[PDB]
Amino acid sequence: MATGDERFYAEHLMPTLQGLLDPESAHRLAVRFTSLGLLPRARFQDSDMLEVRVLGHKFRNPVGIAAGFDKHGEAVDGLYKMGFGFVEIGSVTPKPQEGNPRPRVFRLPEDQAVINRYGFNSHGLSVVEHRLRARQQKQAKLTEDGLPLGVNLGKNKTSVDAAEDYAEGVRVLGPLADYLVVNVSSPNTAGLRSLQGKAELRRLLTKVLQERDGLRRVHRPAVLVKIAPDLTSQDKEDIASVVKELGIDGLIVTNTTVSRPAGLQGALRSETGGLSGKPLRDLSTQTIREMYALTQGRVPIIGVGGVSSGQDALEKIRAGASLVQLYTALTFWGPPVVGKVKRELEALLKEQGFGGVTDAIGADHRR
């Protein structure tokens, strides 16, 4: 069934799977299989070249699974087995909520893209907290061994107080996380991205950071802000300013886009939702570049958006990312894409005269 092998997955297994299952069903199955550890052998051995020290942690490799794949913290261990250097779970909302009605995920095969409007379907903080607690010491050892865990926090659709939603997330899941993500960037919850402008963003993040600072040292995560690729130059300037003013630990750049770039071919291109995958790639990379420059290279960036190769990863790294994430590439190429990206990244680093990933971070800005 599953042997096992970049070409077999890309050319045969995944196309067949996608012919049989709609994207959300495939997503549910992928989560189930991953949680059981039913995966092809991750042959790739991580070299010292790929190791990154950032956010107060060691990362065995700079390739993570983006938020949204494991929304409820169900497959964390299987994701490490897949070869990810770090795992981000979420977004998690304070209370459980169902998200949007189905269908709410759409493939754009011709574009190597996906559009989703899940709408923060979440088991909620309490369920995710107990799920994480069940493996807390296991995670502590994984983190020690260079495999950190991120938790992405959302807010409920019907919440009257957005900042309090995030504050609850910090208090409940913060003690279980190496880093937290304040997701102010979903396409798919009304109002949400408006948390990205200035005086209100400052208010929100001050509250978040205060809650984080009130956790015991051993349970005190880094706090990152995940931003949209659709921000105005003014928005980006404002975010960079608040980030530096408040001492936000890092940025995740970017979420999905509500733009529909010219050239999309998929029949479903005009579905409502965030677009991910290849058509997002360079928009994300350019946002990384801008944010790195606006923060003077002093604020760690996790680069995400259309990464499916070593070149994609390195471009983001050279643009200013210390780490990268992918999601959409996994949906088309399956688990072997993780080793592929890592292998290609290591080769490109050597070819371009970099001693390791760390040496390449922001290299474009020094040209």
Ligand SMILES: Cc1cc2nc3c(=O)[nH]c(=O)nc-3n(C[C@H](O)[C@H](O)[C@H](O)COP(=O)(O)O)c2cc1C
């Ligand atoms: C199906 C789907 C669900 C997602 N859910 C979340 C989410 O819950 N929280 C979040 O911060 N990002 C979410 N994302 C955005 C991804 O984390 C990532 O930022 C974006 O997809 C770009 O990366 P990619 O092109 O590699 O997929 C989701 C993306 C997709 C494809």
Ligand SMILES: COc1ccc(Nc2ccc(Oc3ccccc3)cc2)c(C(=O)O)c1
């Ligand atoms: C919207 O969110 C997703 C998530 C996973 C997907 N697919 C997928 C990802 C990993 C898989 O993992 C495997 C592959 C082969 C053997 C065992 C597990 C399988 C399907 C898809 C899709 O098919 O469109 C969509």
Ligand SMILES: CCCCCCCCCC[N+](C)(C)[O-]
């Ligand atoms: C998730 C869709 C099914 C794809 C085929 C499953 C691959 C099983 C992996 C094989 N094995 C677990 C032994 O390595």
Ligand SMILES: O=C(O)c1cc(=O)[nH]c(=O)[nH]1
């Ligand atoms: O749950 C979702 O709809 C969602 C959240 C998010 O942050 N990004 C995204 O593309 N979808």
